[PDB]
Amino acid sequence: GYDRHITIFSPEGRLYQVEYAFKATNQTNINSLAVRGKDCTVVISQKKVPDKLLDPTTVSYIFCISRTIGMVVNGPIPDARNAALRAKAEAAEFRYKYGYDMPCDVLAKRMANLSQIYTQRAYMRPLGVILTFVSVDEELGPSIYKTDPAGYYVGYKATATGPKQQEITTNLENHFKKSKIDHINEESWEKVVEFAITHMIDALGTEFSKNDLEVGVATKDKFFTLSAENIEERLVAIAEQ
Amino acid sequence: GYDRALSIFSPDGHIFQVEYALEAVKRGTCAVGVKGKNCVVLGCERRSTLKLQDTRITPSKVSKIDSHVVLSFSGLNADSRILIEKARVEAQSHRLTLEDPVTVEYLTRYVAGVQQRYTQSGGVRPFGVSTLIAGFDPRDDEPKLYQTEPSGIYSSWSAQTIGRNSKTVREFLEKNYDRKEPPATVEECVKLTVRSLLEVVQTGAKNIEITVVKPDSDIVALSSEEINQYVTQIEQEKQE
Amino acid sequence: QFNPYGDNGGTILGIAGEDFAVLAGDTRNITDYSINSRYEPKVFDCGDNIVMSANGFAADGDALVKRFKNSVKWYHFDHNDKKLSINSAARNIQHLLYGKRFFPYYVHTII
Amino acid sequence: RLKKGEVSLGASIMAVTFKDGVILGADSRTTTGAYIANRVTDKLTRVHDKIWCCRSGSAADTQAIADIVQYHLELYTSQYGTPSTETAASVFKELCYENKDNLTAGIIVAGYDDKNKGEVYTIPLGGSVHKLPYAIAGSGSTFIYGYCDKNFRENMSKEETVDFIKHSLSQAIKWDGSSGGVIRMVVLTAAGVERLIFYPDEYEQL
Amino acid sequence: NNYDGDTVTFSPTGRLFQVEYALEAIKQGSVTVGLRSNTHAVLVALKRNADELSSYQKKIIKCDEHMGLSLAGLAPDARVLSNYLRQQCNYSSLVFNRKLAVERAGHLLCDKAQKNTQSYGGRPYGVGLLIIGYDKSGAHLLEFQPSGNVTELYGTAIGARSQGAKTYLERTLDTFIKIDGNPDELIKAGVEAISQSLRDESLTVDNLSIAIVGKDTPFTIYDGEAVAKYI
Amino acid sequence: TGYDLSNSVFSPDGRNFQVEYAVKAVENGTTSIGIKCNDGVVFAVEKLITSKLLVPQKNVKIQVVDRHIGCVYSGLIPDGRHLVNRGREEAASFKKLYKTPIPIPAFADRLGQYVQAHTLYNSVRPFGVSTIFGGVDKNGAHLYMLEPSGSYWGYKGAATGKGRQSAKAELEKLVDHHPEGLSAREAVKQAAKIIYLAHEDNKEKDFELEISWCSLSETNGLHKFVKGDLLQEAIDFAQKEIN
Amino acid sequence: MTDRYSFSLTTFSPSGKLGQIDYALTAVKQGVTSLGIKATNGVVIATEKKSSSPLAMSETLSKVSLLTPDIGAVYSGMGPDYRVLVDKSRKVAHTSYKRIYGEYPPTKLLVSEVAKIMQEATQSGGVRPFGVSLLIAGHDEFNGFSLYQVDPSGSYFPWKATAIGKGSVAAKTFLEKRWNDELELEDAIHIALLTLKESVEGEFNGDTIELAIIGDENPDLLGYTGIPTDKGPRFRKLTSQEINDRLEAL
Amino acid sequence: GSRRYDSRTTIFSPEGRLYQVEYALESISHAGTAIGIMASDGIVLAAERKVTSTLLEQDTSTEKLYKLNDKIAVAVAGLTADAEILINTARIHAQNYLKTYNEDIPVEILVRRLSDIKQGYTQHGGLRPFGVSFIYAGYDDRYGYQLYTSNPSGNYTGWKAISVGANTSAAQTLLQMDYKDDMKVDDAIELALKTLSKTTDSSALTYDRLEFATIRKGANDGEVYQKIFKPQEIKDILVKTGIT
Amino acid sequence: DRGVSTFSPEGRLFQVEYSLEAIKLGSTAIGIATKEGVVLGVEKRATSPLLESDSIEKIVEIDRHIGCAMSGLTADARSMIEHARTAAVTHNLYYDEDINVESLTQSVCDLALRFGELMSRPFGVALLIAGHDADDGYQLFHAEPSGTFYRYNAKAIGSGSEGAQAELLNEWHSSLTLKEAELLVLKILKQVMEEKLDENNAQLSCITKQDGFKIYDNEKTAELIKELKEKEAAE
Ligand SMILES: [Cl-]
Ligand SMILES: [Cl-]
Ligand SMILES: [Mg+2]
Ligand SMILES: [Mg+2]
Ligand SMILES: [Mg+2]
């Protein structure tokens, strides 16, 4: 059965290497979440530092692709960094060639097309990662677009990725049924981060310290990550209500 | 580029791809070459499971490489065209640089060298073809007949046959061909060639092709009626 | 426009006897009307009892001698330490020089 | 060294370090021969947040270079963080030096680090790099070598540096036909980035 | 078993079987010994023949006036690697007017052998080398293995039954290291060392091969009647 | 199955068995460590003395990259050398274009991307080394550890090889007992001790100690080897602790 | 390193089957149903928008794509494969035709170019076939309206009406009963919606259905005025509202 | 490395056969039958479409019969996509010859070159062969009317009448029975249809399941005309011979 | 399958070892070196009596001072000879001298291992290279597809090699004349050959300093065959 080793069709029309790349996604055992506000897009992810000898500041799965675009990865770090470096180069080249900042959805499509090539070309393996791109696009506003090893991509009102992704997904679904809208009706990004953390706590059923989380925020004309103290400040506000 | 080594040695010291190329030659229609005192004759079998053929336009079994040299073959027909084309090009190239047409030995050596190159080159299989190359050197009246094979070895023959049931016709030629006295005339040489094919062919109708080559670029192909006369003559002498 | 050649002056002289041979050359090196060095040797022992000088444009002269000295070294490696005969050296040098037929070494060589 | 009939950026450009950082300054004029193709050009251009450059020589060449440098420094930032002004000058040099025969670009690089404060690197036609306290360049700079050498002082204030640039470029404009229009300036400090403009009615009667 | 088809494949225990099979080719090769003092470095090599009618396979190759090696295993592979060393020694002379350090020589060989163990299609080198030389930091002896591993030593030996000579040198370490300014005695110690790897056969005039390099001695090889002194 | 026969093939788990097999080669190698300190880093390694015939001090395993980065590794030594050769090219092109010497995090990703690239195709073999490296740059001191998969993180202390667990345990104690920080000269002494303690897992052949360090104050931000009196002082400190 | 797969990954089996093409067609069978119907004055192409998640915005994912102003495309099978084919199809329409003749290619020739690309993925080294079947509707001056199907093998056939994917067998039967040569465009849209309701299981509205037409020229969608000969694109994607209007009188 | 997954498409069997060529021929034997018959005053090309659907657009369709130039046409049997690759190459080759010599390409030369391309895929490159067999029908001023066939092996032969694809064994026997040398085009048209009508796997032979073409000198004075039959024209010729 | 350049567990290259088996199937070739010259002889082995034996070219000239005999897949030797001839003439062009026999052999042997995944497989032919130069005098070399070459006083290759080599062991001494060597090649060839030895199915050649490399005529060899039979009957 060499049809399970490289990216060619099986008798039932399947690509097993692509399917197994999906299972590599959860190898890190980390859950991520993304939501949109009025003026912003917030992304959050679990941060697990098991070894005491590790420098915790260097342990990250969130990346600043361009000034406007941010990316969180679910999957092993080598493949994650591989994808990050390529996305950075693609976003830089786009700006040079076409005279304006690469939109979030366009970068997502580009990376998805690259992922598709690996599912069709034999010598290249798929990357075992799911890439979640976030920004505040100057045309489409707050944006969430997610890529997988199959080469599939789509926009999102909100989304979640990881081992306990389904619990987070339904938690968010039930909120948007209730609110009757496509986003978090909130002015400041600070409270949108508080929403994101609150609903992750409810879905996963765990409490979080400042070092157990990692947060990325996209606003108009800049994407940035939060420090431990920025998150701690945010955790205090949730507890006091 | 496709690099795979297809022709390789086996534990017992054999290159199976070259040997399997010989099996393709063994499948091919029989071809025979007989050289007389002042001529060479190339005989060729044509299988009769194909009726409704158009013999005007169907590729002939014997091919002119130059005006003084001819090449017949046994094995894969498509493969033979590639060797014939290369040989024809080399024939014109030799005239251009040496200001003299190729010798039969030189042309054979070139074709054999091409066949050999395909036995130790990556990404290619050997030619499923053995050839009989015959003719006369420039300003020379000594007849020349050479044989090549997929491995790339070549050699000169007083008379030789290749293809299916070639071991039967080789047996015939080995007792019927005298080294001390070869076929003195054209008629004698053609008759011996037709006789040898009649040991294998079936019917002497549109199954046998004969091509006669004489010195100073004198090559001609026999028609059906002309060949049929040899068939009619041999059978009447046989009933004895 | 950049001119890749120059004239370093100087002169050389070779004479052959019955059982010996001399190769002489002055030690002055110049450009235009200036003296660069009063002692800059341009006659070299290249091994195997072969002496060589390549006079004219010194950069080309040095490059050539350097390449021939290297040719002698590899001759030993490739042919079981065989002594390079003077006639063989001469033919080898021809190929060094003609190798740059279309961008020549501007030198007069004597061995 | 200019290609025939191509737009000429001949200029009056200068960058001056001072106590709080560095200030870039430039005129506004472009010529093809004696005709002023653009009278309101912006010759001060951003390659990074607080790393800018003054352009002179060929308009097309300097633009193409500046666009490439901006691309390199944006990619540098994504991997290694904020680049030094020296790093930016090095990228300019690499382009100017390696393509010295096909290019006519006299560029002044000026930036503000927090560690290194205000820095100025000038890059003439050859592609050489020269780190200086202040720098002048462009067709009109010849006329103000005397003036600028006599009047420049290290560790000046913002208002003094603005006056030094204004008076200098005013003279360069007055004597160089290839220079003119408005005087644009860009201030680089820890505070941020400030754009200044000065019109003929003001600076001519200095 | 299933993991020895090519060099690009690791075994479940983390082994490269093709590299190990290349190492095996060295063990089948004829014995050769290397040792040094502070002034000189010596190579001794037992040459092998096909039969009495044949010549004896040459084991020692000169790389420069100050450097050379002895081989054990596939001889053509030693020719490729020795040629590479000759070029690198030569590049150092022409470009930098500098004699190549014996340590750099080892580093260059290591990196050349390594590339052949990480790529598809190619194969590992099937030969072991003992490199001796005298450079600006005195005498040197190196041991090259086609896995890539290069090691600097006082003395060593590679090939069939090389353990006997390697044990002897391990005992004699304190004696032969101090043989300074005496070539013939350092060779004698090397000839006695290789003698501990002999079985049924003894050292004859066209069997033994010796090479030396040192302070005021260029790399030179001794064969034939020139080694009769040491029997 | 057969999923472990070819590199870059995902198993049904989502694993690359060939990379995991390369880790086994690393585990088989000698112990090497890295210790991050106040204003720099310290590297140490175990050199097994196979024979009396090995020249002491003359089989150097720790390698310098540029003038400010130190690299040490465990596993297939040649593979480590190949990685360092690449590192030196990466560092050279960075300094060529950007003038400044390559930052350590920058350098870490250059190796990471290169090693990761060797898990993408079946025509190449994964690296059979875990590499501990780091140095001093504009932002201060950094210590990293890189694995066959391409995975790397920053570290306070790092260890790999046959005695990694013993070394890790000893490293964890230093991090707990010194929250404010460890000095450069102290880290050299500690490095010696940890190698000697980690040698208990490889105690058939006796060994030779080798230490290097980068420090903003002690070495002026450059990579240097520890030799002579400072080396013997560190050895004596380690000898006293085992007894 | 380097792509060492210079050899075919699709080969003939003893029975004469090209396995990878067959398996690619199996992947198309699993795919969601899509269809195309040809009228006298237009063409309609339609498909279901299978949403991966309700949080996902199905508007961002477009199954029906514009290739030229007068040509559109829809698929069944693997979405990613389709997306890159659309990119290549749009480019080839320019490079191999418009940049030569100064006008857009007719439907049949653009289809031919797409087929060529899919055939090469069947024979070239180190690649698998595309796991999709396309339906391409289009108009051009000299051929009028036309509808084509393109399979993983690279084979293409012209259709009066057809369906591909999940429930194609039943859907083709339904179309045989309803199709005639006198159908107006509005009648063809009505039949398309009826045919698609049979295969769709969940919600059936303008937000879950994607439908586009090739019909009359649309000057309002051109974007400029002043050139009489330029009258606008014949390709138009029906809005969510426009679909729901026709679902009431169903 | 990649050696593991190589099918080795261009090798010999122990018996001296080319595996992939043999399997490509097996594929072609399931394709719709195509017949070529050469008369003294023209050539007929007839071909059966593969199981037609009633909703297939028949008039604006091309599956079997393709035009190479004004004087040469081909009938296809096998993978259509493969055939179109080869057809465009053949069309280009014909135009290269015309551009070079200012003369229409001789039929055999075009056939040889196309057959040489197929041969290449069996000897080198490591790719699968083209799963196609052609019947070439054409005219030139040297040999007049000519019929050839080529197959995945790259071997070509000339014919008076020939069939490719499905049921060639049965079809060739019927052609061999009723064919004669002094035959006219109109008679050859009737023979082509009668042969398909008996060898077909369908219930009855109809206009919608056929492609038909002639190459006559039926134009005005010493010039050749290619007629690709329309649906209604096939319907009429089918009634005229009394099949429907 | 498996790689072309793969090592066996014993430490040998599979393809090189398999090519050596092909050489054992080949026709016999013998070479003997003396102080008066070097003699080269081969078994022609015609597959059929109709084959004109004089066209069987298994002894070949490389230069005036270097000859060559072959055994195994003889078609593979053509490009080896072509290379040798070019190497020999090229060296004369660069250095105005004859090229050493050893250096020529080394040049040919460099081709041997230039195979893998360069050519697709090793050569399936062994060569006996005989010659003379001023430095090392008369020489005989055995060049294998392994890239290895040994110098020999005498050597036999091919199907009857092990039997012929044992015979050469006893018969060879350092004072052999050229005539004695000629007869010795014929004697040993007649012993190992299947068919009966005569002038048509066996060929002799030699290389001397004075006259260079010469292939003997069938008339000359026939007399040496007759001289050989008479001498064996004489005791
Ligand atoms: Cl793309
Ligand atoms: Cl401008
Ligand atoms: Mg980042
Ligand atoms: Mg793949
Ligand atoms: Mg002015």
Author numbering:
A (entry chain G): 2 to 242
B (entry chain C): 1 to 240
C (entry chain L): 1 to 111
D (entry chain N): -9 to 196
E (entry chain E): 3 to 233
F (entry chain F): 2 to 244
G (entry chain A): 1 to 250
H (entry chain B): 1 to 244
The authors write:
The 20S proteasome core particle (CP) is the key non-lysosomal protease of eukaryotic cells. Its seven different α and seven different β subunits assemble into four heptameric rings that are stacked on each other to form a hollow cylinder.
For subunit β1, this process was previously inferred to require that the propeptide residue at position (-2) of the subunit precursor occupies the S1 specificity pocket of the substrate-binding channel formed by amino acid 45. In subunit β1, we found that Gly(-1) indeed forms a sharp turn, which relaxes on prosegment cleavage. However, the γ-turn conformation and the associated hydrogen bond initially proposed is for geometric and chemical reasons inappropriate and would not perfectly position the carbonyl carbon atom of Gly(-1) for nucleophilic attack by Thr1.
